[PDB]
């Protein structure tokens, strides 16, 4: 069907257990050759006598759409209402889903993915700690601005650049529902690439990996009231919920912890946990030993 | 110009459907396709040319 | 008359010349598990006659001051012939039962017993912040005894009849399948219980599907009635027993 | 003005909600779709693929190719059990980092039959028969071949067909088991024994390895999404 | 019909009183045998002369759905905006309806129940008492996160775990309507079980009762602004409204008070209240004695 | 933007509201329904079932099986009334903790006829006739059999049919009475008398017990949900 | 694709109905079934095989 | 989400408004109506009835 | 399943009507019946058996 539509029937039922009786033949379903690279299609009924079971179990929650389509925090940063640093008056990062692991490991199960994204922002502010704490600051209004690669970059909370005549921006005031919007599949290519065993330069050097393929611009966020007698500080959290998904060439789930955002680097890590012996099976069922 | 389709069945073995209307000009704005359930394990579990009947030897 | 009645399961038959009726579960007769209700995929064993027949448990004595008695159920029949053997060898089991409580006296005796099957009779501890024992719960055949006063002791069930070991009003146990044995009119009680649980099958050692309680509400009494010995006997017969998940026998 | 009442829930942000939202890029012309090979559609497609089980996950093998080798040998060792392990696909070390296991860990419930494929890697002149048994819960692990053969089992004859499949049929009181398994949702164990020792001619190695692969059958499904215990971080720039 | 649908006709009328006159026969409706375990079906017209009454009374409000379908508090806890304990910075419990009695006694009238649940949360915050009370804290935004059994558990208000890439979470800001959502019938079994006369271990030991069957995960809730100059404290209250209900094998209503959450334990308690004598009936109708 | 006006009520949380709400678990596949015996559908199904009335709720019997036994005996006791009690199903000790009573306590209004079944538990050789009377409100409780027989009553003959049913027809100025009954919604009393003493042959006990069961007839209903007075707590971990 | 059904009757012996549309994809999201009023006391008050006519003795 | 604009008046409480509101007692079965004599329908029915005028409303 | 009826006429001697849909399950939730205008003064102003024609004496 069309993977852009918000409706589409059909139950995802698993297989019924076919009733099976005794057998004496040359059929040898339980004997295969794993060398071929084929995974055996044996079901219980091929190796034991089974009853018939009408199975209603469905695989609805393990569909790629339902697995990825849940908002995940992919970034968080702070900025102050007032400070001497100018820089600390606004936040900015470079769009990517590589800075928070949960989301990253989920995506990295697939080599390529294509999708629209529902972005939701959760912004909070707190009054900074100090000796004098009394003030009456009106509601804070924030501005989130997206700068596609190549656009002029803000240099202060009051730069002309925040005019957003063309960059898309969101103005939001505290106390209301978190801001939200959909972004289409924005790639230069036919699918976003999660891994790239390649370089940026033709001479097989330059930058290696995911980074050379990125370049989706950055986000800048600042307060608009711009002031507060006493210092305050806000935290902006951004969430991604992919929707209308397509994925290709699955790969094993990341086993070693991530070391940084630009690389696939890792330290050698254990295949799994140890146990006492290759025959160790704990004894449950005892008058409690 | 709306669409009516069925709901995922809950707590029991006509009022089991919902209606939806799209209010935006871009497909990106639409909700997720949580109801599409296709499947093709074959690409991965059995990518062998020469069909393996497996009830037969597999070699020989 | 309709007081007369006979029942046959396997190589066994019961008779009464003074029955009331026969109570049936919540109106449901036992049935074997249907394909559209099953999860365990292996072929079941259905021993039939070897297993679905009348087993008689050890009798108890009704004394002028007996508070009552109880038995937990799949456990209690665990040593009864092949029904018990099939229990030991399988992970999953399912059965219904015909329960027949017998108690005869004389036209000059009096007393009244409530005979109830309580599904899922989770019991409370004597020691309020402690927990029970399997021993405080059941002793297989034999039978635990209710008590006329509050009990103490760690692990034992708080058994004052008045609260039926469950924290309710004993006199409300009637929402459960039951019959009364009023000596002046009746000499036995028969209840057919269907399998009742929130899963299609279950392990028979780990879960007491239901408890049988015999509680005298009007006490035994008589005169120079050279019969002071008035026993009560419980006979039960598994119905539609089926088992799944065969392997080595469970550790006693 | 059309009359309206806001219901509880108004203005909340539920992670798993599913609503329409304005696009910040009106009329953006998305790049054409390209037909890439290997499209995945349901995580179960991945769980249905065999992956190698680290059966020999003994201290000292945790970072060496041995953890994947089950040692078996010539001579009299019948009394000696070849291996055994619990059937907790999403929890026990033997399975948790498997393709099937990693997937189960993103869910809280599972149900279905499992396939265990065993492949013999000795010389072609080697010979032998093994007994592969699965015991549903309720008793302790068989301690002898006698006890093990009373449960579900195949007798595997090593031959030209290098591999043998022990399928673990779904036998449970409940339709589902916790991936984070407890005793209530126990699934039993599988153990392996020499049915008739490994015989070999002269000039060939007297000991070899058997490998074990796991994969889900077609009656397998999972429910109730949750995060994996397996990945974490102490700070950003992740 | 289908017990998942929000509409379904038919009036639940009680029985009309059939007009009855004088009788002299062998009919003996007022004489039955309670020993059979059958409840007599006698109506007024079988024992006295009755007029005819067209009765319009309906049993609508005693239908299982209308009896259980009202939100009930099933839990309440506190957490602080700021403290030295780290632990006191977020709240967490294990889902169950066994900690508040009203709801619990209602459910326990049935042995098994099956239903979807409408969860509504009421969150409130107060400023803690102290010598200095002046501050200007922006609106508090909370995060409620559900952790299915087996998911990683937060260890501090700033744990990576709150990223909820997959656990479902709710972000809500004070002043708005209480947060709410529906949860489907989530059991591993065919019906939630309110009582379980059984064990966790096959050797008839381990844990006894309801608890072995539970395991529905837990809830964690924390503030997101994370700060406040002066200490504040919030209370989270969770309400359950079952809907689309089915119930089986009714049992007597709990008579003795509950002693704890994990057990059915109780102390011996009176069957009912006493009165003077078995014939005592107070005299109303007197020129006031 | 479509024009809208919020009405009073917007954003409130009413315990008994009834609205749709987003699911936090999109597409969750619920486990199949199983046909369990004993499905309940209306609490009245429970109230229609007989349960034993603690008629002898006298000080000292509150925790013993006696509270359920009505004492009756051989010899001349005609002047002596056997028992009596008010008809306040949800309020008087005699009824409040009954199956019918516990249910009535979750409501504020009730209406309908009530069945009182009396069962004789003496020896089979025992004999006797009793007069079971119900007096609608307006006068004080009959103080003699003469006065009692002027109201609604059955004369019960002990015989093979061990039980007798006194049905209390609904007679009231209003269609409903408060479960928390007051004088305005009074319902009267039922009293019992020897109609002709208990006679018995030699060798049999000269005193026995009569039990009393209560249940609702089919014209019975209840309204206006409220919490029960009967359950409470001082703190959580309940 | 909506449903119209009747309202519970109030303060008096066509405008006595309401309309509803489901906006969610899961049945769990729907409102309660407050209008279903079946009943079967029998399971409990009369679970005896052998029908008791009661106008007849019940024993004998 | 369907696009909406709140108009002046939103959230006010006008004594003489006239809107629908959720019932706090879902499915309550009201007691049957009874035909009482003397039903009034418009206050003018009362004003159309003669009443005695206090014409001699003099001090005392 | 909605109802259209006319509005009370205002400031002048088709667009003079409104539409309504009931969203609740109980009649109690509905808005007021401000448009019902019956009347029967008779119950009160003339409850005499024996019809008084009044254009005739009334006595005699
Ligand atoms: C671009 C904003 C468009 C607003 C669309 C709102 C649709 C309102 C439902 C109208 C009734 C359905 C008509 C059919 O189709
Ligand atoms: C998933 C969100 C769907 C939004 C559905 C709103 C339906 C608006 C009423 C439209 C007019 C009724 C059409 C018919 O049927
Ligand atoms: C119980 C809540 C029900 C919500 C009902 C909203 C009705 C929306 C108007 C839909 C268009 C009219 C269909 C016709 O009739
Ligand atoms: N104001 C929001 C700007 C959003 C642009 C987001 C582009 C997200 C692309 C998702 C990329 C994930 C990947 O590399 O797989
Ligand atoms: N964020 C809410 C998570 C809700 C899960 C609730 C599951 C409720 C199950 C109701 C259980 C009641 C019972 O044991 O009978």
Coordinates of N, CA and C in Angstrom, one line a residue, chain G residues 9-40:
Chain G
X9 N -33.9 8.2 29.6 CA -35.0 9.1 29.8 C -35.0 9.8 31.2
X10 N -35.2 11.1 31.2 CA -35.2 12.0 32.4 C -36.6 12.7 32.7
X11 N -36.6 13.6 33.6 CA -37.7 14.4 34.1 C -39.1 14.6 33.4
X12 N -39.6 13.6 32.6 CA -40.9 13.6 31.9 C -41.4 12.2 31.3
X13 N -42.7 11.9 31.5 CA -43.4 10.6 31.0 C -43.4 10.4 29.5
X14 N -37.9 11.9 19.9 CA -37.1 12.5 18.8 C -35.9 13.3 19.3
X15 N -36.0 14.2 20.3 CA -34.9 15.0 20.8 C -34.4 14.2 22.0
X16 N -34.8 13.0 22.1 CA -34.4 12.1 23.2 C -33.3 11.2 22.7
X17 N -32.4 11.7 21.8 CA -31.2 11.0 21.4 C -30.0 11.8 21.1
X18 N -28.8 11.1 21.1 CA -27.6 11.7 20.9 C -26.7 11.1 19.8
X19 N -25.7 11.8 19.4 CA -25.0 11.2 18.3 C -23.5 11.1 18.8
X20 N -22.8 10.1 18.3 CA -21.4 9.9 18.7 C -20.5 9.5 17.6
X21 N -19.3 9.9 17.6 CA -18.3 9.6 16.5 C -17.0 9.2 17.3
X22 N -16.3 8.1 16.9 CA -15.1 7.7 17.6 C -13.9 8.3 16.9
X23 N -13.0 8.9 17.6 CA -11.9 9.6 17.0 C -10.6 8.9 17.1
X24 N -10.6 7.8 17.9 CA -9.3 7.0 18.1 C -9.2 5.7 17.4
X25 N -7.9 5.2 17.3 CA -7.8 4.0 16.6 C -7.9 2.7 17.4
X26 N -8.0 2.8 18.7 CA -8.1 1.7 19.6 C -9.4 1.6 20.3
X27 N -10.0 0.4 20.4 CA -11.3 0.3 21.1 C -11.2 0.8 22.6
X28 N -10.0 0.6 23.2 CA -9.8 1.0 24.5 C -10.1 2.5 24.8
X29 N -9.9 3.3 23.7 CA -10.1 4.7 23.9 C -11.6 5.1 23.9
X30 N -12.5 4.2 23.5 CA -13.9 4.5 23.5 C -14.5 4.7 24.9
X31 N -15.6 5.4 25.0 CA -16.3 5.6 26.2 C -16.9 4.3 26.8
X32 N -17.5 4.4 28.0 CA -18.0 3.2 28.7 C -19.4 2.7 28.0
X33 N -19.7 1.4 28.2 CA -21.0 0.8 27.7 C -22.0 0.9 28.9
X34 N -22.4 2.1 29.1 CA -23.3 2.3 30.2 C -24.8 2.0 29.8
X35 N -25.0 1.6 28.5 CA -26.3 1.4 28.1 C -26.7 -0.1 27.9
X36 N -25.7 -1.0 28.1 CA -26.0 -2.4 28.0 C -26.7 -2.9 29.3
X37 N -27.9 -3.4 29.2 CA -28.6 -3.9 30.5 C -29.1 -5.4 30.4
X38 N -28.2 -6.4 30.2 CA -28.6 -7.8 30.2 C -28.7 -8.3 31.6
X39 N -29.1 -9.5 31.8 CA -29.2 -10.1 33.1 C -29.5 -11.6 33.1
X40 N -29.0 -12.4 34.0 CA -29.2 -13.8 34.1 C -28.9 -14.3 35.5

